[PDB]
């Protein structure tokens, strides 16, 4: 199926040894990281917090991100909420209404206390998700009816309930209200093919604000935004070289279907790379969605042995090493070496000194040669530590001086460093094979440009093309040189030195394995810049600073993972190839999985951005608060799939207070449907009076009003009642201002009860402002008990400054046989608590304006329309008919 | 935690006054709590470590 795997000559055709895959190396790499930190913490006296190291199921995590793409933040409903109610009384033709949105806003979270700061943040988040979850509907297929030629709507789709008003209302206003119910007509409803329903209604302004943003979203987010997203998915498949079917996408929209698109496919890749200490978590997600399943191909066995007649056979110099097998421990070390070659800067190797294992001394000296022509310590990236590259130069110094043939001459240098001599008859200077991390004089990348830039990438953050040993992946399609001149500089100097030291039988081996060597790096290049190109890859501003922060030893936030290999694992990784067979299963669903993950991080950042300012707005509430409280609060009201990706390296326990504060200040947001529906919900809560929380609560000595009634019907008609709710707050003069620091000291000095009563006797007003309070609304007919009547704004335990207050309405119900002095007593009953709210909540308005609240232009869809989501169709394997210019 | 800055708990200090707090007067008990809230924790730097 591919032009590069057509194996004509039987050179590259060899035996299959083992296999590997994407979803297997992802769980293997996290095991080898967490086993190392659980090993050094068991051998030494370590003193830290107990952090459990469990290896999470990666395949369950990637499935749960995919199930989140099928979520629907909107909902389909036929009728809106109730949104208004009326309470009847003794009066006819005069009632009082109740906006029942604030009744629903009363019992949302818990009571705000001045000692639990984490419970304050969860009370806020529970309110805003209640606003967004309620005001996000479509209102499809409302019921209507007919009246005298015009189309009037059924009264159930109006947001007023008045069914208790009719059996007490007079027969004159029954017809005066019936013209209004037949006045809620359908606008331009007497034309067919309308395809929509327009009517007027009543709903509260904090929820109607969400209804405008969702309805305005579908007007602007349509086919052209699907046109950009599919056109971007063509360019990623244009690079990754996937095959297409003969089926293209046509932009034919039906006349009865409405498209809703919740995501955007060009992902801002900075959003993933601001998550604190997520450098290892981005690596494991890169393996699971991009590595293809391959087989380790052993080289052709006729390279060593050439059989002449029957019993005459040429034998190799490493006859003992080629006929060995890797044990099950060492095979897990070959899978580390190819895991460190595919991810160039991010994974670095070491040596793993082990006293239990006893090897031949010759396998170390042979594997000092193989390390010098397989790895890379050049001027751009490194595959191996400053210590691992030091024990290879000593292993080369010992191999070049243990001469089992006739000794060649050697002239040492003035220092004592390894490889400081001039071996050979013609005195090849062996000084150039010591590791020099600024130029890479020994390993690959000596005279090679192994990082090049040639085209703008689909993911804008990773533009580089890794080219191991200066070889393109197009030297398997159209080769440049012959089958003998396939040589590069870092290998060729190793051969002409190994001949000079008399080891020209081993040099015959490494020369005859040159084209097998170059083909392997020509397939690693076809995995790095062709398959492992995701948003989870490393950006260029972190890749370029990996090596120059390794030499200086400075601190870095993209610190590499150090893994351990063995000595013989250097040899067994030489004679393998990893030629991939099948690409990864979830490669096509990959960028939709990245899109949901980047979008859910965007809505988490906004929920911490607004909560971080509450201390600078109400400092008297949050005394014992810290930035880890809203970090703990909004992570509870978040999907567990996105939380499981952020804790892939158990970094939830290793974050200090100035790292989570750095994430909430980094500007990078991925716009989607939910963020366009969340930021509108936060805009409706920037006053807190729509959250039933206020600071303007007063205390003022005032008697319960005893209406000295003389006419029974006039007292019955006018609708007499009493509430503690002010219509307007008192003046700035004549009042006394208290706060938390003043009122707390007066309780400890014993002057809180005394100095407050002197204000109550001089007929003044005291404000307890500074903190917030939970406010409820109650209704009573007879005399309410003491807590409501004298209910103090504070309490005792030494005081509770933020006690829950209440709003009570006392409807005076009178009968015929009551004395005018019956409700007049000798000694009055005072009330103290008086709260102002600045909201139209409970207003006593006559029945001429009972349905004057119909001022909301609702827009509804007809029942023939269809509402379908198209977010699940943003796969990479799709192609569209009309290409994007 | 207190007012957005960090303070130390009273047992982290090297004194034990738990037997004198029941006898001590309520006027000075609120003043010894305010005196206890003055031991702020400065951030330091020991070989480039927090």
Q: What are the CA-CA distances from residue A219 to residues A216, A225, A242, A259, A427 (Å)? A: 5, 12, 35, 10, 80
In this structure, how many other beta carbons lie within 10 angstroms of the beta carbon of residue A109?
A: 18
DSSP string for residues in A309-376: SSS-B---TTHHHHT----TTTHHHHHHHHHHHHSTTTEEEE----SS----THHHHHTTTGGGGTSB
The answer to whether residues A62 and A586 touch, using CB atoms and an 8 Å cutoff, is yes
The answer to whether residues A112 and A774 touch, using CB atoms and an 8 Å cutoff, is yes
Phi-psi region of A139 (alpha: psi -120 to 50; beta: other; left: phi over 0): left
In this structure, how many other beta carbons lie within 10 angstroms of the beta carbon of residue A359?
A: 12
Q: How many contacts (CB atoms, under 8 Å) link A and B?
A: 20
How far, in Å, CA of A435 to CA of A378, rounded?
A: 9
How far, in Å, CA of A612 to CA of A632, rounded?
A: 13
In this structure, how many other beta carbons lie within 10 angstroms of the beta carbon of residue A323?
A: 9
Give residue numbers after which chain A breaks (C–N above 2.5 Å): 797
How far, in Å, CA of A169 to CA of A128, rounded?
A: 39
Site of tokens 């927090």: B50
For A772-819, the three-class secondary structure string (H helix, E strand, C coil) is: CEEEEEEEECCCCCHHHHHCCCCEECCEECCCCEEEEEEECCCCCCCC
CA-based R_g, chain B, Å: 14
The answer to whether residues A765 and A702 touch, using CB atoms and an 8 Å cutoff, is no
Residues 6+ apart with CB under 8 A from A581: A292, A293, A294, A295
* DSSP-based helix, strand, coil % in chain A, nearest 5: 35, 15, 50
Closest partner residue to B26 (CB to CB) among A624, A656, A748 is A748
Residue count of chain B, please give it.
Answer: 50
Nearest-Cα distance to chain B for A796, in Å, is 15
The answer to whether residues A622 and A124 touch, using CB atoms and an 8 Å cutoff, is no
Q: What are the CA-CA distances from residue A244 to residues A237, A241, A565 (Å)? A: 9, 10, 41
In this structure, how many other beta carbons lie within 10 angstroms of the beta carbon of residue A52?
A: 8
Which positions in chain B touch A749 (Cβ < 8 Å)?
27
B18-34: string of b/e by CB count within 10 Å (b at 16+)?
A: eeeeeeeeeeeebeeee
For A236-291, the three-class secondary structure string (H helix, E strand, C coil) is: HHHHHCCCCCCCCECCCCCCCEEEECCCCCCCCCCCHHHCCCCHHHHHHHHHHHHC
How far, in Å, CA of A155 to CA of A144, rounded?
A: 9
* Residue (of B9, B30, B4) closest to A748 by Cα position: B30
First to last CA, chain A: 30
Q: What are the CA-CA distances from residue A74 to residues A158, A215, A221, A607 (Å)? A: 21, 11, 15, 20
Which positions in chain B touch A623 (Cβ < 8 Å)?
1-3
* Residue (of A620, A630, A675, A622) closest to A122 by Cα position: A630
Tokens of A461: 């953050």
Which positions in chain A touch B50 (Cβ < 8 Å)?
656
The answer to whether residues A571 and A267 touch, using CB atoms and an 8 Å cutoff, is no
Interface probe with B: pick from A554, A748, A752, most Cβ of B within 10 Å = A748
H/E segment holding residue A492: helix A489-498
Tokens of A416: 């004592």
Tokens of A799: 């005081």
Which positions in chain A touch B37 (Cβ < 8 Å)?
none
In this structure, how many other beta carbons lie within 10 angstroms of the beta carbon of residue A580?
A: 19
Which positions in chain B touch A629 (Cβ < 8 Å)?
none
Residues 6+ apart with CB under 8 A from A130: A104, A105, A108
Nearest-Cα distance to chain B for A343, in Å, is 29
Residue A222, classified by CB atoms within 10 Å of its CB into exposed (0-12), middle (13-18) or buried (19+), is: middle
Strand partners, A410: A423
- Alpha helical stretches, state H, A612-751: 614-617, 628-634, 640-646, 657-663, 673-683, 712-717, 740-748
In this structure, how many other beta carbons lie within 10 angstroms of the beta carbon of residue A513?
A: 16
Nearest-Cα distance to chain A for B1, in Å, is 5
Tokens of A520: 């392997």
How far, in Å, CA of A88 to CA of A168, rounded?
A: 8
How far, in Å, CA of A449 to CA of A14, rounded?
A: 31
Which runs of E-coded beta strand occur in A369-502?
A: 422-423, 428-429, 451-452, 465-466
Which positions in chain B touch A625 (Cβ < 8 Å)?
1, 4
Q: Is the Cβ pair B1, A626 closer than 8 Å?
A: yes
Tokens of A173: 């206003």
Give Dmax (Cα) for chain A: 136
How far, in Å, CA of A735 to CA of A818, rounded?
A: 39
Beta strands A85-87 and A94-98 are antiparallel
DSSP-derived letter for residue A66 is H
Nearest-Cα distance to chain A for B3, in Å, is 5
Residues 6+ apart with CB under 8 A from A855: A200, A202
The answer to whether residues A633 and A622 touch, using CB atoms and an 8 Å cutoff, is no
Tokens of A807: 């709003």
Q: What is the resolution of this structure in A?
A: 3.6
The answer to whether residues A114 and A771 touch, using CB atoms and an 8 Å cutoff, is yes
Nearest-Cα distance to chain B for A619, in Å, is 7
Tokens of A538: 């490393």
The answer to whether residues A270 and A281 touch, using CB atoms and an 8 Å cutoff, is no
Residue A286, classified by CB atoms within 10 Å of its CB into exposed (0-12), middle (13-18) or buried (19+), is: buried
How far, in Å, CA of A612 to CA of A628, rounded?
A: 10
* Residue (of A705, A512, A15) closest to A504 by Cα position: A512
How far, in Å, CA of A795 to CA of A782, rounded?
A: 26
Quick one: closest CA in B to A623, which residue?
A: B3
How far, in Å, CA of A72 to CA of A74, rounded?
A: 5
Residue A283, classified by CB atoms within 10 Å of its CB into exposed (0-12), middle (13-18) or buried (19+), is: buried
How far, in Å, CA of A533 to CA of A240, rounded?
A: 8
How was this structure obtained? Answer: cryo-EM
DSSP string for residues in A594-628: HHHHHHHHHHHHHHHHHHTTHHHH-TTT-SS--TH
Q: Is the Cβ pair B27, A748 closer than 8 Å?
A: yes
Strand partners, A795: A800
How far, in Å, CA of A225 to CA of A217, rounded?
A: 12
How far, in Å, CA of A512 to CA of A494, rounded?
A: 14
User: CA B27 from chain center: how many Å?
Assistant: 18
Site of tokens 């391959």: A294
Helix crossing, B26-36 with A740-748: angle to 10°? 140
Q: Is the Cβ pair A623, B2 closer than 8 Å?
A: yes
Beta strands A144-147 and A830-835 are unpaired
Q: Is the Cβ pair A624, B30 closer than 8 Å?
A: no
Strand partners, A834: A698
CA-based R_g, chain A, Å: 39
Residues 6+ apart with CB under 8 A from A367: A395, A567, A568, A570, A571
Quick one: closest CA in B to A614, which residue?
A: B4
DSSP string for residues in A82-125: ---EEE--S-SSEEEEE-HHHHHTTSSSPPP-SS-HHHHHHHHH
A484-500: string of b/e by CB count within 10 Å (b at 16+)?
A: eebebebbebbbebbbb
How far, in Å, CA of A498 to CA of A368, rounded?
A: 13
Task: Report angle CA A550, A365, A446 to the nearest 5 degrees.
Answer: 45
The answer to whether residues A251 and A227 touch, using CB atoms and an 8 Å cutoff, is yes
How far, in Å, CA of A81 to CA of A686, rounded?
A: 24
Which of helix, strand or coil describes residue A140? strand
What is the torsion angle, in degrees rounded to the nearest 10, for the CA atoms of residue A450, residue A453, residue A455 and residue A459?
Answer: 90
How far, in Å, CA of A214 to CA of A131, rounded?
A: 13
How far, in Å, CA of A507 to CA of A669, rounded?
A: 57
User: CA A551 from chain center: how many Å?
Assistant: 34
Residues 6+ apart with CB under 8 A from A230: A249, A265, A874, A878, A880, A884
Beta strands A697-703 and A765-767 are antiparallel
Q: Is the Cβ pair A748, B1 closer than 8 Å?
A: no
For A195-226, the three-class secondary structure string (H helix, E strand, C coil) is: CEEEEEECCCHHHHHHHHHHHHHHHHCCHHHH
The answer to whether residues A603 and A272 touch, using CB atoms and an 8 Å cutoff, is no
User: CA A470 from chain center: how many Å?
Assistant: 38
Which runs of E-coded beta strand occur in chain B?
A: none
* Residue (of A235, A230, A225, A231) closest to A458 by Cα position: A235
How far, in Å, CA of A99 to CA of A104, rounded?
A: 9
Q: What are the CA-CA distances from residue A791 to residues A107, A201, A697, A804 (Å)? A: 20, 39, 12, 10
Site of tokens 């008003």: A165
DSSP-derived letter for residue A300 is P
Which of helix, strand or coil describes residue A858? strand
Which of helix, strand or coil describes residue A718? coil
A140-179: string of b/e by CB count within 10 Å (b at 16+)?
A: bbbebeeeeeebbbebebbbbbbeebeeebeeebeeebee
How far, in Å, CA of A77 to CA of A214, rounded?
A: 14
Quick one: closest CA in A to B3, which residue?
A: A623
Nearest-Cα distance to chain A for B15, in Å, is 24
Which positions in chain A touch B28 (Cβ < 8 Å)?
none
């Amino acid at each position: 199926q591919r032009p590069e795997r057509i194996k004509t000559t039987p050179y590259l055709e060899g035996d299959v040894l083992s296999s590997d895959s994407g979803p297997l190396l992802s769980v293997f790499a996290l095991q080898e990281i967490m086993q190392k930190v659980r090993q050094v913490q068991a051998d030494y006296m370590t003193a830290t917090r107990e952090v459990d190291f469990t290896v999470p199921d990666v395949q369950k995590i990637l499935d749960d991100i995919k199930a989140l793409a099928a979520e629907q933040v909107y909902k389909i409903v036929k009728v809106p909420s109730i949104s208004f109610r009326h309470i009847v009384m003794q009066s006819r033709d005069r009632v009082l209404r109740v906006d029942t949105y604030y009744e629903e806003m009363s019992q949302v979270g818990d009571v705000i206390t001045e000692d639990e700061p984490e419970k304050f943040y969860s009370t806020i988040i529970k309110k805003v998700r209640f606003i967004r979850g309620k005001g996000s509907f479509i209102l499809h297929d409302i019921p209507t009816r007919d009246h005298r030629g015009m189309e009037v709507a059924e009264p159930e789709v109006l947001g007023v309930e008045f069914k208790n008003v009719l059996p007490v209302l007079t027969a004159e206003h029954r017809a005066m209200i019936q013209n209004a119910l037949d006045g809620s007509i359908i606008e331009n409803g007497n034309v067919a093919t309308r395809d929509v329903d327009v009517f007027i209604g009543a709903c509260s302004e904090p929820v109607y604000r969400i209804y405008n943003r969702l309805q305005g979203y579908i007007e602007a987010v349509q086919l052209q935004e699907l046109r950009n997203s599919i056109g971007w998915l063509e360019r990623l498949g244009h690079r990754k070289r996937i095959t297409y079917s003969q089926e293209v996408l046509t932009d034919f929209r039906r006349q009865d279907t409405i498209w809703v698109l919740a995501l955007q496919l060009p992902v801002n890749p900075q959003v993933v790379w601001d998550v604190p200490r997520s450098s290892i978590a981005n690596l494991i997600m890169n393996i699971a969605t991009c590595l293809p399943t391959g087989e380790y191909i052993a080289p052709n066995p006729r390279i060593s042995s050439i059989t002449l007649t029957q019993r005459i056979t040429t034998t190799g110099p490493f006859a003992i090493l080629t006929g060995s097998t890797p044990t099950a421990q060492q095979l897990n070390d070959v899978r580390k070496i190819y895991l460190a070659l595919m991810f160039p800067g991010q994974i670095i190797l070491d040596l793993k000194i082990d006293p239990g294992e006893r090897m031949d001394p010759a396998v170390r000296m042979v594997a000092g040669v193989v390390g010098h022509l397989l790895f890379t310590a050049g001027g751009r990236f490194t595959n191996l530590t400053q210590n691992m590259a030091r024990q290879l130069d000593i292993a080369l110094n010992d191999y070049l001086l243990y001469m089992y043939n006739t000794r060649v001459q050697v002239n040492y240098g003035p220092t004592g460093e390894p490889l400081d001599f001039q071996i050979g008859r013609n005195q090849y200077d062996c000084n150039v094979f010591r590791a020099d991390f600024a130029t890479g004089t020994g390993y690959n990348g000596w005279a090679t440009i192994d990082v090049e830039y040639r085209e703008p990438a689909p993911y804008v953050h990773a533009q580089r093309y890794i080219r191991y040993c200066g070889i393109d992946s197009r030297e398997l399609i159209n080769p440049t040189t012959y089958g003998i001149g396939m040589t590069y500089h870092c290998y060729n100097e190793m051969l002409r030195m190994l001949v000079a030291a008399g080891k020209d039988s081993e040099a015959a081996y490494f020369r005859s394995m040159l084209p097998f060597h170059m083909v392997r790096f020509a397939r690693i290049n076809q995995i790095i810049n062709e398959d492992l190109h995701s948003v989870f890859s490393l950006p260029d501003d972190m890749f370029n600073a990996l090596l120059p922060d390794l030499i200086a030893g400075a601190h870095q936030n993209a610190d590499p993972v150090v893994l351990d290999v063995s000595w013989i694992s250097l040899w067994f990784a030489f004679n393998r190839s990893f030629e991939p067979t099948h690409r990864n299963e979830m490669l096509e669903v990959a960028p939709l999985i990245e899109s949901v993950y980047a979008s859910e991080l965007s809505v988490m950042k906004v929920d911490m951005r607004h909560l971080s300012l509450m201390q600078r707005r109400f400092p008297d509430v949050l005394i014992q608060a810290r930035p880890s409280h809203f970090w703990k609060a909004v992570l509870n009201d978040s999907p567990e799939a996105v939380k499981a990706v952020m804790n892939l390296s158990h970094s939830h326990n290793f974050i200090n207070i100035r790292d989570m504060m750095r994430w909430v200040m980094l500007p990078s947001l991925q716009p989607s449907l939910k963020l366009a529906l969340e930021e509108e919900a936060w805009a409706a809560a920037n006053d807190f009076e729509d959250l039933m929380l206020t600071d303007q609560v007063y205390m003022h000595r005032d008697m319960l009003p005893e209406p000295r009634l003389d006419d029974i019907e006039r007292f019955r008609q006018e609708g007499f009642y009493y509430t503690n709710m002010l219509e307007a707050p008192p003046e700035i003069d004549r009042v006394v201002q208290y706060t938390y620091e003043i009122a707390r000291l007066q309780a400890n000095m014993g002057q809180f009860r005394a100095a407050l009563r002197r204000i109550m006797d001089d007929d003044d007003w005291v404000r307890f402002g500074g903190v917030l309070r939970t406010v409820r609304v109650k209704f009573y007919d007879a005399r309410p008990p003491d807590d409501v009547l004298q209910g103090l704004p504070f309490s005792y335990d030494t005081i509770k400054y933020a006690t829950e207050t209440t709003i009570f309405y006392l409807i005076y119900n009178v009968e015929f046989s009551n004395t005018p002095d019956s409700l007049v007593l000798i000694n009055p009953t005072y009330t103290m608590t008086k709260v102002f709210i600045n909201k139209r909540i409970v207003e006593r308005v006559r029945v001429g304006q009972i349905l004057a609240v119909l001022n909301r232009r609702f827009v509804a869809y007809k029942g023939k329309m269809r509402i379908m989501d198209i977010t699940q169709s943003l796969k990479m394997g799709t192609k569209l008919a009309a290409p994007t210019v």
